[PDB]
Design a protein around this nucleic acid. Structure first.
Lengths: 77, 96, 90, 101, 88, 101, 80, 99
DNA sequence: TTTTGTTTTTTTCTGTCTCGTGCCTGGTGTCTTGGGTGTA
DNA sequence: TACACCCAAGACACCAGGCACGAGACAGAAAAAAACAAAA
């Protein structure tokens, strides 16, 4: 399901960051990085989901998994 | 007919997406990818709407920061177009 | 579920009598307050454990603020905390 | 709260510091100091957000206003450097090399 | 300090290998840092679940969250074996 | 320590967890688990350091051996990313573009 | 006075050679000295804060370790 | 006969290998101690320092400088250059989050 | 010299803003005793 | 390390505006025309 993030979506994400021109080998590559990001967050949240004896990944687990890596997120407490 | 030059629409989109704070990634494909990734860690898992929204916001912010670092690395190399080498250098300097 | 939405709204009305706040902004302010609270509490606990002290007083909070907040923000927070302590003691 | 001249609660802060697994005992001036610091920070942030909203012709505070108020200030951005604000966006900053002419 | 324990562990894993004082201090600092990290993670996990008691499950979750992959798996297995041997 | 078959102290770890102000109550399996994890980590690090020392014809573990053992291992480098080892140095890594063409 | 000049050119050259730098320019030493001074000030501020919190007049190694840990530079071998 | 003279690039790599194989302190002790004392004097006058604290400070500063030099060399090689420039240091410190 | 981005000026409904208001929950006096600092 | 000392934790008894449920309305995005400097 890594092909869901279309190339124009990555183009918009780069335009938000101030990127003028984008090559062709960026999007797919970025996609992989995105996966890595999820592979560095969701699993941790899953661990939290495995600590409260629950089966639903709540927003608090995601907030704790993001804070535990230095990426503090607001507006979801 | 009118035809824009390769550079005006890029800056226009930059300004438009920097002025607005809307989500740039679609909800259904991102949710499907999140579920497929979480399935590899633990089977029979549920997700809330707030958790999916927080994950999407965090991923968008991380991608925006990575693209900013990539544009900085590309400008430092006397270039305008971004390359995967720029992203690799950014991820190596950041420690990822 | 307890939250500091009432106090944030009161502070906003104090600094801006004719200005509202959305729900997402309220949640962001709540998360910011919680993060600052946790950081200062952890720094104070570390400072108390480093000195073999089991009590956290205003000095530990002042040291935590001076270590976390940078420069003018730390100075203003220390001044406000000292003023509040003096007003509460009197 | 009323004795210290602060709108933030002192008893709630004391209870959170007692049950927060930080120390065996909590002093009487520590919750007052922490509430005063939190109130000062919240007042500064809310004043900056209200200024940004008045500059945007709006009587409400949105996450975009909070982001524009925090990222513009130097010390506030240094304090919240590793903080991600949801629905806040980024600063409209464009490099001079990408500009025409 | 953890000097005698680190020395015994080294003798168990390497019967013919010594250790200097600086290396011993580095090992003690690493042990203290891991102890502090795992204790903080366990305290956070206990506070998030409205629990006032830290058991082996909290330490296992802290190890799984801190240590990555095979290291976490092996540490969890060793901790479970030690717990089952101590409880028996 | 004798009942759990571990070299690390269990009573000392329990006392440290009780006096560290982490929770109101501490179970009997948590200190054993923490001591076992610490012992396994120490054993892995010491084995890697001894291997690095044997690769350098050395009988005593020096901080350079610990640095070579931590940096060469991927998991140990990921766990100790923001960790600085004193008198350990760095890895002898030279880029290919700097070599004489 | 003017102790920032203690980190002379050969010291910066050796520190660059340790990091794998082949060629060094001329304006590199000044920027390196400035960054080193900034980092030393940022660490010594927290060290002095930790020392004054203990009502002491001697900066021990534990204060430096705590100041480096609270920033993001965990250092080992100085806890004994 | 002309005396021996190494071309630009040999002794540089030799020193790179020598300083990457050894882990000795590259910064002198007395100037670094004087600089640390002068910096600490600006915050609080009449301050004492132990040998272990100064050694830890020197080790941390050397490690941070080595990491910054590695990042600077990476940024310089990325820009199709060999000699390092202050722009590379600025880019490294901006990406790392210091500026 | 002519086509296209950027700025000004009407209403009009439009998501939201403070007023009206009841329950109670957390917003105040008062006795005890005592352990954490104040000062030395 | 020692003698003193005084307001909080605990508990009893008494008391007041938040907060969500509606509503009339309030500044504004949009719909749309019209108009000036700069860009191609």
């Amino acid at each position: 399901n890594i092909q869901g993030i279309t190339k124009p979506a990555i183009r918009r994400l780069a335009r938000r960051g101030g990127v003028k021109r984008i090559s062709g080998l960026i999007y797919e590559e970025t996609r992989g990085v995105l996966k890595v990001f999820l592979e560095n967050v969701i699993r941790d949240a899953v661990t939290y989901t495995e600590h409260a004896k629950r089966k639903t990944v709540t927003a608090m687990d995601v907030v704790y998994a993001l804070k535990r890596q230095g990426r503090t997120l607001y507006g979801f407490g | 007919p009118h035809r824009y030059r390769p550079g005006t629409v890029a800056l226009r989109e930059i300004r438009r997406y920097q002025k607005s704070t809307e989500l740039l990634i679609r909800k259904l494909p991102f949710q499907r990818l999140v579920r497929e990734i979480a399935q590899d860690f633990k089977t029979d898992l549920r997700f809330q709407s707030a958790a999916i929204g927080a994950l999407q916001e965090a991923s968008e912010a991380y991608l925006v920061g990575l693209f900013e670092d990539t544009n900085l690395c590309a400008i430092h190399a006397k270039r305008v177009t971004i390359m995967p080498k720029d992203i690799q250098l950014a991820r190596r300097i950041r420690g990822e | 579920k307890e939250s500091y939405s009432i106090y944030v709204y009161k502070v906003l009305k104090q600094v801006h009598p004719d200005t509202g706040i959305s729900s997402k902004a309220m949640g962001i302010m709540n998360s910011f307050v919680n993060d600052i609270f946790e950081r200062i509490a952890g720094e104070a606990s570390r400072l108390a454990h480093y000195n073999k002290r089991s009590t956290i007083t205003s000095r530990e909070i002042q040291t935590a603020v001076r270590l976390l907040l940078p420069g003018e923000l730390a100075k203003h927070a220390v001044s406000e905390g000292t003023k509040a302590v003096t007003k509460y003691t009197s | 709260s009323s004795r210290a001249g602060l709108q933030f609660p002192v008893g709630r802060v004391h209870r959170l510091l007692r049950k927060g697994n930080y120390s065996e005992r909590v002093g009487a001036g520590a919750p007052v100091y922490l509430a005063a610091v939190l109130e000062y920070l919240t007042a500064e942030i809310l004043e900056l957000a209200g200024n940004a909203a008045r500059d945007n012709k709006k009587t409400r505070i949105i996450p975009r206003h909070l982001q524009l108020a925090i990222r513009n200030d130097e010390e506030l951005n240094k304090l919240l450097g590793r903080v991600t604000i949801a629905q806040g966006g980024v600063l409209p900053n464009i490099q001079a090399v990408l500009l025409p002419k």
